[PDB]
């Protein structure tokens, strides 16, 4: 789900 990508980015940047 393309929609989930930015959540993953946010997480791995944290």
């Amino acid at each position: 789900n393309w929609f989930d990508i930015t959540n993953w980015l946010w997480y791995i940047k944290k």
Partner: antibody
Amino acid sequence: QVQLVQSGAEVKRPGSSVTVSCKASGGSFSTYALSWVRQAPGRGLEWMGGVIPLLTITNYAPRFQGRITITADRSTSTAYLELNSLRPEDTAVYYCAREGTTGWGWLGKPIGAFAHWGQGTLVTVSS
Amino acid sequence: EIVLTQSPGTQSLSPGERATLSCRASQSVGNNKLAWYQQRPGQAPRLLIYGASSRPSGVADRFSGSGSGTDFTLTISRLEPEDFAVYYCQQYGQSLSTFGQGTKVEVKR
């Protein structure tokens, strides 16, 4: 606060290509999903596609796959919608929309749903 | 493709009355990724509910979302004059996001 400012209304000839711009300020441009949604006169909302600027990853609705291009320019925090081979039924208000965040400022966890909307751009396909 | 059905497409209700708006999905909506938007003529849509039941700050708490799977509901506890408007549901549980065709809540007189 996130603000999305779109380019002005444009009349386009049938068969031509239109580029609509969406300049963002506030929050993060590169790490949040930017989508385009259109609304034909007197009709409902239709999601066209989106881009995640940092990763240069696009996602187009099948109905527009092959007729649209969405790009993002990080130097100007501007996203662009290209729609090609225009027909009268492409006459619509085109909106750019960015996903919201939780919190707590404008740099929090993304929510996917579209919290932030541009003012819309009327594209009129006509001779 | 997930088809979202908003029926009826219009509701005629009295000022102050409770409103319940249905949004049914043709298949289960992943992770309850279901949003509701309000739109008034000449204005951009506005996010009211995301994740089926979460309400952004600033949105009046007379708006509440509920449901899961295929069956979603927007409830307006008491219709204020500004609540007469069009409401869209949207699913974003698949890469192909789709909207319902909207329900116009208008004033019964």
